[PDB]
């Protein structure tokens, strides 16, 4: 479950007493008792007041952060730390616009480890005004990922192996090197 | 996925925290404390996130997949050489048995075709590599000649005359004969029948007849392919019909006493024309255009059927009508193109919108019809559904008895007919279009886009293959068709081989949206059969017969190609079968006390040869386990 | 006649009832109308699913 319910010491934007008629608002027991009913309805009005915040990934409770992952397919699995999820879901939509792009591949690994990589890609981009001029680019495909981790625990090679597996465009080989 | 976790029984009673009324169950104020209305609020509160989910989806712009209409091919036989007129009425709905528990799926004869009452022209005979040089005219009535020279030479051909050739139908040719001495079995005669067309030569199908060919007088009912064009059959005007002759063909019967030719008459029994499971709406106006951009126009029939010219509306230009293209999304439009988008699951047509740019100006994506012009919808397709796939062609209202023609035949089961996707299904489709954005690029999208291209496949997974000699490696995709327990347990095999359609269809969709210059491979994974044999001693007060029955299937269940393993789903494409893991299955079987030893016997569905006995089988990554028949010894004091 | 007719099931063999026929069994050409018990499940018998 989630262990939600009532919250002590929370006010309401719609006091029950404030909607009572005049003259009725003069009693001691009626005003105190009917204000007690505000306790049960207190947190519902908070939700409707701040429903917009309940959708921003940077602020919503942890449960909805994973749910907001399935909103736009953010790869929520495998992470057992809340702060790691916080960046992933918000930055997921930007990544999917550059899947298979040098910046996109570099950012994804950077996103999952916190440090920028040092990649070399088999090719590039260069023009030439010469008619039917030759185009350079490495003769054979090759993808390499280098990570400058400070504390290379011997599990990051597999983690980089799994992570870069989806980033590569199912087209060319690859290798994983971790500091 | 939820906001609050209260219910009606959840009563706080915090009045004592402010007041001093001290009865847990008082007269009436407990009733006052009873607030069901909160329960009727929180229940409606918990469903808000789902409503918001369906809310922002429209902001993203994803829609529902329109249903596609099942299509079938039907043939209007006549059983008479007559009806020199249009033998195809558009419509003529035919359905199944109108049972009260299942809806009789109806159809509609869509297209039209015209045939000709053709008559035989010339009648010739020739063999492989040798010209006709025969009667070629008098064979129509007399001057009998042995057919095919009574020899199965490779390339023997017969040219037969057919005056006023029919470009598209199925016909028969009467070449009577007097066959004696040897009678060739009707099953699979070694001949290939062919007809001339614009492109050249093309194979013609056959149909039912009471004779096996030259083993009794009668006809042969060829299926003339489309594109048949006339020629010069000497003294007549006839299209060319060809009869290729093959060798004994690994023992197929052939005659050396081939019969002669008695007479000639051409029947032209019937024609061929497809039909689909969808109605049509013709020339229905939908409104008058206004000069403003971004207009949305409705229609009168909700579930519009998919198709490339889905609606094909026309605007009233000064030259008749001007047609409009259809694009799924408007981002690809141009400030001068003629594009629309259609939400076919509800029947909306929306022209190009106008977007304010960063400069404060306007970027009109897609042109707008001129003010006051007439907007008209030409054609519709409504209908389609999962039930649109007929079974075996047994429409059962196949119109056996008709007064116009003899019979209308629908043999081959209809294809297509994908049902419209549910709203719940769309939620599981939202991430895919939010990350792939079409044009599958990496390994994950190939797995997902395969399902979207064709979801009738049981399961798909994509693995890189052997490397190309230039340093790359072409993409490989594995297909496992949906299987049914055809034999008595286990599986029949030859059902896991796709029928040349799933390989074609999936590849065709992927090729258009793919990285250029990279080859794609599709096929089934590697397979090899594995058999478990052991000896399990039963308990002293159990029926070994049930133990014998139970242990043969429970051990088998662990090796199921489609739903095996401990998870109960398909195998993970690389898990190696082992006795130790199968030792877990063996121990749990009821009516057992201990097991002696288990022997594994690898094999194949191709070769009955079996492999050497080994405990551990090395299974390749793009491969799956095949479970065979097996026996184990149950020796024990059974009851 | 001294015969017992049984059918295969998930559990095993069970007695199958008979009904009227014009022949007493092998005393003349004819059929025998067995009563198939519940639980009959297919198996493998040569080139047929019997």
């Amino acid at each position: 479950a989630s262990q939600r319910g009532s919250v002590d010491g929370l006010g309401s934007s719609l006091p029950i007493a404030s909607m009572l008629p005049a003259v009725f608002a003069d009693d001691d027991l009626a005003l105190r008792f009917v204000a007690g009913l505000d306790d049960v309805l207190a947190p519902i009005l908070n939700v409707l007041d701040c429903l917009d915040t309940y959708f921003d990934p940077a602020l919503t409770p942890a449960d909805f952060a994973q749910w907001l992952g399935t909103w736009v397919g953010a790869e929520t699995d495998g992470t057992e730390a809340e702060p790691m999820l916080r960046a992933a879901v918000a930055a997921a939509a930007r990544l999917h616009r550059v899947r298979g792009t040098l910046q996109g591949l570099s950012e994804t690994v950077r996103l999952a480890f916190g440090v920028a990589p040092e990649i070399t890609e088999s090719g590039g981009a260069t023009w030439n005004a010469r008619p039917l001029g030759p185009f350079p680019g490495r003769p054979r495909p090759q993808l390499h990922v280098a990570l400058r981790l400070p504390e290379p625990r011997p599990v990051d090679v597999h983690r980089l192996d799994a992570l870069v597996a989806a980033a590569r465009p199912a087209h060319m080989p690859y290798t994983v090197e971790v500091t | 996925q939820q906001f609050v976790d209260d219910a009606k029984r959840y009563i706080q009673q915090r009045a004592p925290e402010w007041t001093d009324h001290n009865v847990s169950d008082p007269g009436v104020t407990l009733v006052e404390t009873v607030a069901h209305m909160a329960d009727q609020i929180v229940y409606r509160l918990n469903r808000v996130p789902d409503k918001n989910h369906l809310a922002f989806l429209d902001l993203v712009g994803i829609t529902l997949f329109p249903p596609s209409a099942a299509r079938t091919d039907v043939t209007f036989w006549l059983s008479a050489p007559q009806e020199d007129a249009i033998l195809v009425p558009v419509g003529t709905e035919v359905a199944t048995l109108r049972t009260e528990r299942d809806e009789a799926v109806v159809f509609a004869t869509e297209q039209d075709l015209r045939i000709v009452p053709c008559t035989m022209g010339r009648l010739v005979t020739q063999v492989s590599g040798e010209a006709v040089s025969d009667r070629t005219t008098d064979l129509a009535e007399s001057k009998d000649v042995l057919c095919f020279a009574e020899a199965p030479n490779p390339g023997d051909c017969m040219l037969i005359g057919l005056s006023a050739a029919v470009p598209d139908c199925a016909l028969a040719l009467e070449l009577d004969s007097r066959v004696d001495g040897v009678g060739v079995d009707p099953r699979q005669p070694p001949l290939v029948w062919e007809a001339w067309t614009e492109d050249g030569w093309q194979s013609c199908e056959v149909d039912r007849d009471g004779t096996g060919g030259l083993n009794r007088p009668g006809d042969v009912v060829l299926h003339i392919p489309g594109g048949h064009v006339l020629s010069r059959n000497g003294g007549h005007e006839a299209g060319w019909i060809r009869c290729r002759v093959t060798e004994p063909l690994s023992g197929q019967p052939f005659y050396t006493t081939s019969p002669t030719i008695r007479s000639a008459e051409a029947y032209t029994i019937g024609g061929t024309t497809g039909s689909i499971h969808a109605e049509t709406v013709l020339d229905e106006p939908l409104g008058e255009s206004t000069g403003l951009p971004g207009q949305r126009l409705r229609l009168e029939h909700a579930p519009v059927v998919a198709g490339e010219p889905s609606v094909l509306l026309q605007t009233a230009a000064d030259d008749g009508w001007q047609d409009w293209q259809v694009v799924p999304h408007f981002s690809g439009s141009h400030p001068d193109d003629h594009h629309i988008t259609v939400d076919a699951t509800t029947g909306e047509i929306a022209f190009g919108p106008a977007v304010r740019e960063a400069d404060g100006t306007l970027r009109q994506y897609g042109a707008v019809p001129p003010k006051g012009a007439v907007i008209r919808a030409r054609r519709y397709r409504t209908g389609g559904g999962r039930a649109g796939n007929v079974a075996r062609g047994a429409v059962q209202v196949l119109r056996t008895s008709i007064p116009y023609v003899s019979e209308v035949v629908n043999r081959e089961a209809a294809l297509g007919g994908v049902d419209g996707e549910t709203i719940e299904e769309a939620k599981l489709r939202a991430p895919i279009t939010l990350r792939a954005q079409e044009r599958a690029v990496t390994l994950r999208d190939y797995e997902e886009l395969a399902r979207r291209a064709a979801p009738e496949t049981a399961r798909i997974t994509c693995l890189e293959g052997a490397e190309n000699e230039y340093g790359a490696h072409a993409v490989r995709v594995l297909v496992v068709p949906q299987a049914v327990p055809d034999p008595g347990g286990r599986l029949r095999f030859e059902q896991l081989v796709p029928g040349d359609a799933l390989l074609n269809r999936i590849t065709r969709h992927l090729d258009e949206r793919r990285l250029i210059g990279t080859r794609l491979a599709v096929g089934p994974p590697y397979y090899q059969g594995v058999t478990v044999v052991a000896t399990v001693h039963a308990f002293r007060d159990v029926d070994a017969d049930r133990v014998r029955r139970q242990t043969h299937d429970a051990l088998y269940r662990h090796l199921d190609p489609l739903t095996g393993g401990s998870d109960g789903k398909g195998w993970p494409f690389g898990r190696p079968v082992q006795t130790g893991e199968l030792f877990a299955v063996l121990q749990r079987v009821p009516g057992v006390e201990l097991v002696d030893e288990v022997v594994l016997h690898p094999a194949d569905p191709l070769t009955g040869k079996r492999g050497d006995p080994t405990n551990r089988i090395d299974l390749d990554a793009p491969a799956l386990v095949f479970s065979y028949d097996h026996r184990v010894r149950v020796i024990g004091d059974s009851a």
Side-chain angles (χ1 to χ4, degrees), chain A residues 2 4 39 55 63 71 99 140 166 168-169 171, chain B residues 1-3 52 56 441-442 445 469-470 518:
Chain A
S2 308
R4 322 193 84 98
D39 178 54
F55 283 155
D63 161 50
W71 238 238
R99 273 185 112 198
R140 313 262 289 197
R168 151 207 63 238
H171 193 197
Chain B
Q1 216 190 56
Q2 82 298 342
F3 262 10
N52 271 138
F56 97 109
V441 50
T442 166
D445 326 293
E469 70 274 334
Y470 284 84
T518 290

PDB file of all heavy atoms in Angstrom, chain A residues 2 4 39 55 63 71 99 140 166 168-169 171, chain B residues 1-3 52 56 441-442 445 469-470 518:
ATOM      1  N   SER A   2       0.326   2.347   0.544  1.00  0.00           N
ATOM      2  CA  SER A   2       1.031   3.620   0.564  1.00  0.00           C
ATOM      3  C   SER A   2       0.985   4.341   1.904  1.00  0.00           C
ATOM      4  O   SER A   2       1.713   5.326   2.072  1.00  0.00           O
ATOM      5  CB  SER A   2       0.474   4.556  -0.518  1.00  0.00           C
ATOM      6  OG  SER A   2       0.447   3.911  -1.778  1.00  0.00           O
ATOM      7  N   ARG A   4      -1.233   6.309   3.363  1.00  0.00           N
ATOM      8  CA  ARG A   4      -1.733   7.674   3.316  1.00  0.00           C
ATOM      9  C   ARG A   4      -2.873   7.823   4.321  1.00  0.00           C
ATOM     10  O   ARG A   4      -3.094   6.958   5.173  1.00  0.00           O
ATOM     11  CB  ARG A   4      -2.162   8.029   1.896  1.00  0.00           C
ATOM     12  CG  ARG A   4      -1.251   7.458   0.831  1.00  0.00           C
ATOM     13  CD  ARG A   4      -1.524   8.078  -0.523  1.00  0.00           C
ATOM     14  NE  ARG A   4      -0.818   9.341  -0.699  1.00  0.00           N
ATOM     15  CZ  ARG A   4       0.328   9.471  -1.351  1.00  0.00           C
ATOM     16  NH1 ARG A   4       0.935   8.430  -1.897  1.00  0.00           N
ATOM     17  NH2 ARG A   4       0.876  10.676  -1.464  1.00  0.00           N
ATOM     18  N   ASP A  39     -10.888  18.269   9.990  1.00  0.00           N
ATOM     19  CA  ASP A  39      -9.722  17.397  10.095  1.00  0.00           C
ATOM     20  C   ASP A  39      -9.769  16.285   9.056  1.00  0.00           C
ATOM     21  O   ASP A  39      -8.754  15.962   8.429  1.00  0.00           O
ATOM     22  CB  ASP A  39      -9.638  16.819  11.509  1.00  0.00           C
ATOM     23  CG  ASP A  39      -8.470  15.870  11.687  1.00  0.00           C
ATOM     24  OD1 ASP A  39      -7.323  16.271  11.399  1.00  0.00           O
ATOM     25  OD2 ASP A  39      -8.697  14.723  12.121  1.00  0.00           O
ATOM     26  N   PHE A  55       2.544  16.500 -10.778  1.00  0.00           N
ATOM     27  CA  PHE A  55       2.932  15.929 -12.058  1.00  0.00           C
ATOM     28  C   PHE A  55       4.342  16.286 -12.494  1.00  0.00           C
ATOM     29  O   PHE A  55       4.903  15.573 -13.332  1.00  0.00           O
ATOM     30  CB  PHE A  55       1.957  16.364 -13.158  1.00  0.00           C
ATOM     31  CG  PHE A  55       0.656  15.631 -13.127  1.00  0.00           C
ATOM     32  CD1 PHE A  55      -0.482  16.196 -13.659  1.00  0.00           C
ATOM     33  CD2 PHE A  55       0.573  14.374 -12.563  1.00  0.00           C
ATOM     34  CE1 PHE A  55      -1.676  15.523 -13.630  1.00  0.00           C
ATOM     35  CE2 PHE A  55      -0.622  13.696 -12.531  1.00  0.00           C
ATOM     36  CZ  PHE A  55      -1.748  14.271 -13.064  1.00  0.00           C
ATOM     37  N   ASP A  63       6.562   7.567  -5.758  1.00  0.00           N
ATOM     38  CA  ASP A  63       5.703   6.630  -6.472  1.00  0.00           C
ATOM     39  C   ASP A  63       5.359   7.143  -7.862  1.00  0.00           C
ATOM     40  O   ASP A  63       5.423   6.392  -8.842  1.00  0.00           O
ATOM     41  CB  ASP A  63       4.424   6.377  -5.678  1.00  0.00           C
ATOM     42  CG  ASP A  63       3.316   5.815  -6.538  1.00  0.00           C
ATOM     43  OD1 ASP A  63       3.568   4.828  -7.262  1.00  0.00           O
ATOM     44  OD2 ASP A  63       2.196   6.365  -6.505  1.00  0.00           O
ATOM     45  N   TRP A  71       4.980   7.239 -18.340  1.00  0.00           N
ATOM     46  CA  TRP A  71       4.387   8.308 -19.135  1.00  0.00           C
ATOM     47  C   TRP A  71       5.086   8.423 -20.482  1.00  0.00           C
ATOM     48  O   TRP A  71       4.435   8.454 -21.533  1.00  0.00           O
ATOM     49  CB  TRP A  71       4.491   9.631 -18.377  1.00  0.00           C
ATOM     50  CG  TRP A  71       3.208  10.350 -18.103  1.00  0.00           C
ATOM     51  CD1 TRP A  71       2.887  11.615 -18.491  1.00  0.00           C
ATOM     52  CD2 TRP A  71       2.102   9.876 -17.332  1.00  0.00           C
ATOM     53  NE1 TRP A  71       1.640  11.951 -18.035  1.00  0.00           N
ATOM     54  CE2 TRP A  71       1.135  10.899 -17.318  1.00  0.00           C
ATOM     55  CE3 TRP A  71       1.828   8.682 -16.663  1.00  0.00           C
ATOM     56  CZ2 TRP A  71      -0.081  10.767 -16.664  1.00  0.00           C
ATOM     57  CZ3 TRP A  71       0.621   8.553 -16.017  1.00  0.00           C
ATOM     58  CH2 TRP A  71      -0.320   9.589 -16.020  1.00  0.00           C
ATOM     59  N   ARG A  99      18.125  10.095 -30.079  1.00  0.00           N
ATOM     60  CA  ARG A  99      18.588   8.714 -30.037  1.00  0.00           C
ATOM     61  C   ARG A  99      19.402   8.397 -31.282  1.00  0.00           C
ATOM     62  O   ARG A  99      18.987   8.703 -32.404  1.00  0.00           O
ATOM     63  CB  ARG A  99      17.406   7.754 -29.924  1.00  0.00           C
ATOM     64  CG  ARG A  99      16.964   7.479 -28.504  1.00  0.00           C
ATOM     65  CD  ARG A  99      15.865   6.437 -28.480  1.00  0.00           C
ATOM     66  NE  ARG A  99      16.311   5.184 -27.884  1.00  0.00           N
ATOM     67  CZ  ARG A  99      15.697   4.022 -28.047  1.00  0.00           C
ATOM     68  NH1 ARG A  99      14.618   3.910 -28.801  1.00  0.00           N
ATOM     69  NH2 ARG A  99      16.181   2.943 -27.437  1.00  0.00           N
ATOM     70  N   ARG A 140      36.248   0.982 -41.817  1.00  0.00           N
ATOM     71  CA  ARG A 140      35.421  -0.015 -41.163  1.00  0.00           C
ATOM     72  C   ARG A 140      34.738   0.578 -39.938  1.00  0.00           C
ATOM     73  O   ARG A 140      35.313   1.445 -39.269  1.00  0.00           O
ATOM     74  CB  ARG A 140      36.260  -1.230 -40.742  1.00  0.00           C
ATOM     75  CG  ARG A 140      37.196  -1.739 -41.821  1.00  0.00           C
ATOM     76  CD  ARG A 140      36.597  -2.925 -42.550  1.00  0.00           C
ATOM     77  NE  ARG A 140      36.575  -4.119 -41.712  1.00  0.00           N
ATOM     78  CZ  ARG A 140      36.417  -5.353 -42.172  1.00  0.00           C
ATOM     79  NH1 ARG A 140      36.258  -5.595 -43.462  1.00  0.00           N
ATOM     80  NH2 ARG A 140      36.416  -6.367 -41.314  1.00  0.00           N
ATOM     81  N   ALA A 166      21.646  -0.577 -25.666  1.00  0.00           N
ATOM     82  CA  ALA A 166      20.470   0.051 -26.255  1.00  0.00           C
ATOM     83  C   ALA A 166      20.813   1.340 -26.992  1.00  0.00           C
ATOM     84  O   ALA A 166      20.116   1.706 -27.946  1.00  0.00           O
ATOM     85  CB  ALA A 166      19.427   0.330 -25.174  1.00  0.00           C
ATOM     86  N   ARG A 168      23.541   2.051 -28.805  1.00  0.00           N
ATOM     87  CA  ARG A 168      24.104   1.785 -30.120  1.00  0.00           C
ATOM     88  C   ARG A 168      22.979   1.510 -31.114  1.00  0.00           C
ATOM     89  O   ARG A 168      22.005   0.829 -30.776  1.00  0.00           O
ATOM     90  CB  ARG A 168      25.053   0.590 -30.057  1.00  0.00           C
ATOM     91  CG  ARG A 168      25.149  -0.198 -31.348  1.00  0.00           C
ATOM     92  CD  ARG A 168      25.523  -1.638 -31.077  1.00  0.00           C
ATOM     93  NE  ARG A 168      24.506  -2.322 -30.289  1.00  0.00           N
ATOM     94  CZ  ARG A 168      24.730  -2.900 -29.119  1.00  0.00           C
ATOM     95  NH1 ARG A 168      25.919  -2.851 -28.541  1.00  0.00           N
ATOM     96  NH2 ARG A 168      23.739  -3.543 -28.511  1.00  0.00           N
ATOM     97  N   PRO A 169      23.075   2.016 -32.341  1.00  0.00           N
ATOM     98  CA  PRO A 169      21.963   1.851 -33.286  1.00  0.00           C
ATOM     99  C   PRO A 169      21.931   0.490 -33.964  1.00  0.00           C
ATOM    100  O   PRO A 169      21.680   0.410 -35.170  1.00  0.00           O
ATOM    101  CB  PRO A 169      22.216   2.966 -34.304  1.00  0.00           C
ATOM    102  CG  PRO A 169      23.690   3.134 -34.295  1.00  0.00           C
ATOM    103  CD  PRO A 169      24.138   2.880 -32.880  1.00  0.00           C
ATOM    104  N   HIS A 171      23.783  -1.398 -35.249  1.00  0.00           N
ATOM    105  CA  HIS A 171      24.399  -1.324 -36.564  1.00  0.00           C
ATOM    106  C   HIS A 171      25.873  -1.689 -36.569  1.00  0.00           C
ATOM    107  O   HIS A 171      26.326  -2.376 -37.486  1.00  0.00           O
ATOM    108  CB  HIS A 171      24.230   0.089 -37.128  1.00  0.00           C
ATOM    109  CG  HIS A 171      24.537   0.196 -38.585  1.00  0.00           C
ATOM    110  ND1 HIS A 171      24.783   1.401 -39.206  1.00  0.00           N
ATOM    111  CD2 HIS A 171      24.644  -0.752 -39.544  1.00  0.00           C
ATOM    112  CE1 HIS A 171      25.022   1.190 -40.487  1.00  0.00           C
ATOM    113  NE2 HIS A 171      24.947  -0.107 -40.718  1.00  0.00           N
TER     114      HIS A 171
ATOM    115  N   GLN B   1      -0.090   5.673  -8.380  1.00  0.00           N
ATOM    116  CA  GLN B   1      -1.295   5.414  -9.157  1.00  0.00           C
ATOM    117  C   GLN B   1      -2.544   5.644  -8.313  1.00  0.00           C
ATOM    118  O   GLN B   1      -3.651   5.304  -8.727  1.00  0.00           O
ATOM    119  CB  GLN B   1      -1.284   3.984  -9.705  1.00  0.00           C
ATOM    120  CG  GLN B   1      -1.900   3.831 -11.091  1.00  0.00           C
ATOM    121  CD  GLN B   1      -2.080   2.376 -11.497  1.00  0.00           C
ATOM    122  OE1 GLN B   1      -2.719   1.598 -10.791  1.00  0.00           O
ATOM    123  NE2 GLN B   1      -1.514   2.005 -12.639  1.00  0.00           N
ATOM    124  N   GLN B   2      -2.358   6.221  -7.128  1.00  0.00           N
ATOM    125  CA  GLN B   2      -3.463   6.506  -6.223  1.00  0.00           C
ATOM    126  C   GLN B   2      -3.112   7.723  -5.380  1.00  0.00           C
ATOM    127  O   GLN B   2      -1.939   8.044  -5.176  1.00  0.00           O
ATOM    128  CB  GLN B   2      -3.779   5.300  -5.331  1.00  0.00           C
ATOM    129  CG  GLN B   2      -2.883   5.181  -4.112  1.00  0.00           C
ATOM    130  CD  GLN B   2      -1.419   4.999  -4.472  1.00  0.00           C
ATOM    131  OE1 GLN B   2      -1.081   4.643  -5.601  1.00  0.00           O
ATOM    132  NE2 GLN B   2      -0.542   5.248  -3.511  1.00  0.00           N
ATOM    133  N   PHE B   3      -4.148   8.396  -4.881  1.00  0.00           N
ATOM    134  CA  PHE B   3      -3.990   9.640  -4.136  1.00  0.00           C
ATOM    135  C   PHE B   3      -4.262   9.506  -2.651  1.00  0.00           C
ATOM    136  O   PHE B   3      -3.539  10.092  -1.844  1.00  0.00           O
ATOM    137  CB  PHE B   3      -4.922  10.715  -4.701  1.00  0.00           C
ATOM    138  CG  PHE B   3      -4.260  11.649  -5.661  1.00  0.00           C
ATOM    139  CD1 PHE B   3      -2.989  11.394  -6.136  1.00  0.00           C
ATOM    140  CD2 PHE B   3      -4.915  12.781  -6.096  1.00  0.00           C
ATOM    141  CE1 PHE B   3      -2.385  12.257  -7.025  1.00  0.00           C
ATOM    142  CE2 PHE B   3      -4.316  13.643  -6.989  1.00  0.00           C
ATOM    143  CZ  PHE B   3      -3.052  13.387  -7.449  1.00  0.00           C
ATOM    144  N   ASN B  52      -6.111  12.502 -16.178  1.00  0.00           N
ATOM    145  CA  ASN B  52      -5.011  13.337 -16.637  1.00  0.00           C
ATOM    146  C   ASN B  52      -4.135  12.600 -17.639  1.00  0.00           C
ATOM    147  O   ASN B  52      -3.589  13.222 -18.557  1.00  0.00           O
ATOM    148  CB  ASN B  52      -4.186  13.812 -15.447  1.00  0.00           C
ATOM    149  CG  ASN B  52      -4.698  15.112 -14.870  1.00  0.00           C
ATOM    150  OD1 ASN B  52      -4.768  15.280 -13.654  1.00  0.00           O
ATOM    151  ND2 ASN B  52      -5.064  16.042 -15.743  1.00  0.00           N
ATOM    152  N   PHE B  56      -3.272  14.562 -21.333  1.00  0.00           N
ATOM    153  CA  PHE B  56      -2.083  15.069 -22.006  1.00  0.00           C
ATOM    154  C   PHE B  56      -1.746  14.265 -23.249  1.00  0.00           C
ATOM    155  O   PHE B  56      -0.935  14.716 -24.064  1.00  0.00           O
ATOM    156  CB  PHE B  56      -0.880  15.073 -21.062  1.00  0.00           C
ATOM    157  CG  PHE B  56       0.020  13.880 -21.208  1.00  0.00           C
ATOM    158  CD1 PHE B  56       1.279  14.021 -21.769  1.00  0.00           C
ATOM    159  CD2 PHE B  56      -0.384  12.626 -20.789  1.00  0.00           C
ATOM    160  CE1 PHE B  56       2.115  12.939 -21.909  1.00  0.00           C
ATOM    161  CE2 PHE B  56       0.451  11.540 -20.929  1.00  0.00           C
ATOM    162  CZ  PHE B  56       1.702  11.698 -21.493  1.00  0.00           C
ATOM    163  N   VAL B 441      15.764   2.591 -35.053  1.00  0.00           N
ATOM    164  CA  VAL B 441      17.189   2.875 -35.164  1.00  0.00           C
ATOM    165  C   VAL B 441      18.026   1.874 -34.378  1.00  0.00           C
ATOM    166  O   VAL B 441      18.976   1.291 -34.911  1.00  0.00           O
ATOM    167  CB  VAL B 441      17.509   4.322 -34.730  1.00  0.00           C
ATOM    168  CG1 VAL B 441      16.878   4.637 -33.383  1.00  0.00           C
ATOM    169  CG2 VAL B 441      19.007   4.532 -34.676  1.00  0.00           C
ATOM    170  N   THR B 442      17.694   1.659 -33.110  1.00  0.00           N
ATOM    171  CA  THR B 442      18.491   0.799 -32.252  1.00  0.00           C
ATOM    172  C   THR B 442      17.765  -0.518 -32.001  1.00  0.00           C
ATOM    173  O   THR B 442      16.654  -0.752 -32.487  1.00  0.00           O
ATOM    174  CB  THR B 442      18.834   1.500 -30.934  1.00  0.00           C
ATOM    175  OG1 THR B 442      19.330   0.535 -29.999  1.00  0.00           O
ATOM    176  CG2 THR B 442      17.625   2.165 -30.342  1.00  0.00           C
ATOM    177  N   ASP B 445      14.028  -0.694 -30.671  1.00  0.00           N
ATOM    178  CA  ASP B 445      12.927  -0.338 -31.558  1.00  0.00           C
ATOM    179  C   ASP B 445      12.605  -1.451 -32.544  1.00  0.00           C
ATOM    180  O   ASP B 445      11.447  -1.601 -32.944  1.00  0.00           O
ATOM    181  CB  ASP B 445      13.240   0.949 -32.313  1.00  0.00           C
ATOM    182  CG  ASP B 445      14.051   1.919 -31.494  1.00  0.00           C
ATOM    183  OD1 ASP B 445      13.527   2.438 -30.486  1.00  0.00           O
ATOM    184  OD2 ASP B 445      15.202   2.182 -31.879  1.00  0.00           O
ATOM    185  N   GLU B 469      31.689  -8.981 -44.520  1.00  0.00           N
ATOM    186  CA  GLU B 469      33.109  -8.956 -44.850  1.00  0.00           C
ATOM    187  C   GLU B 469      33.675  -7.547 -44.953  1.00  0.00           C
ATOM    188  O   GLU B 469      34.896  -7.399 -45.047  1.00  0.00           O
ATOM    189  CB  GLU B 469      33.354  -9.704 -46.160  1.00  0.00           C
ATOM    190  CG  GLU B 469      32.820  -8.990 -47.386  1.00  0.00           C
ATOM    191  CD  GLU B 469      31.359  -9.293 -47.647  1.00  0.00           C
ATOM    192  OE1 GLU B 469      30.892 -10.374 -47.235  1.00  0.00           O
ATOM    193  OE2 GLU B 469      30.679  -8.451 -48.270  1.00  0.00           O
ATOM    194  N   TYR B 470      32.830  -6.519 -44.950  1.00  0.00           N
ATOM    195  CA  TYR B 470      33.289  -5.138 -44.996  1.00  0.00           C
ATOM    196  C   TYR B 470      33.317  -4.485 -43.620  1.00  0.00           C
ATOM    197  O   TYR B 470      33.511  -3.269 -43.528  1.00  0.00           O
ATOM    198  CB  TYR B 470      32.420  -4.320 -45.950  1.00  0.00           C
ATOM    199  CG  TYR B 470      32.721  -4.586 -47.404  1.00  0.00           C
ATOM    200  CD1 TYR B 470      32.137  -5.657 -48.067  1.00  0.00           C
ATOM    201  CD2 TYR B 470      33.596  -3.775 -48.113  1.00  0.00           C
ATOM    202  CE1 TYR B 470      32.412  -5.910 -49.393  1.00  0.00           C
ATOM    203  CE2 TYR B 470      33.875  -4.020 -49.442  1.00  0.00           C
ATOM    204  CZ  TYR B 470      33.280  -5.090 -50.077  1.00  0.00           C
ATOM    205  OH  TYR B 470      33.551  -5.343 -51.401  1.00  0.00           O
ATOM    206  N   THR B 518      21.999  -0.727 -44.943  1.00  0.00           N
ATOM    207  CA  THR B 518      22.187  -1.856 -44.042  1.00  0.00           C
ATOM    208  C   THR B 518      21.155  -2.930 -44.348  1.00  0.00           C
ATOM    209  O   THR B 518      19.951  -2.657 -44.348  1.00  0.00           O
ATOM    210  CB  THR B 518      22.071  -1.415 -42.585  1.00  0.00           C
ATOM    211  OG1 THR B 518      23.209  -0.618 -42.237  1.00  0.00           O
ATOM    212  CG2 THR B 518      22.007  -2.625 -41.669  1.00  0.00           C
TER     213      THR B 518
END
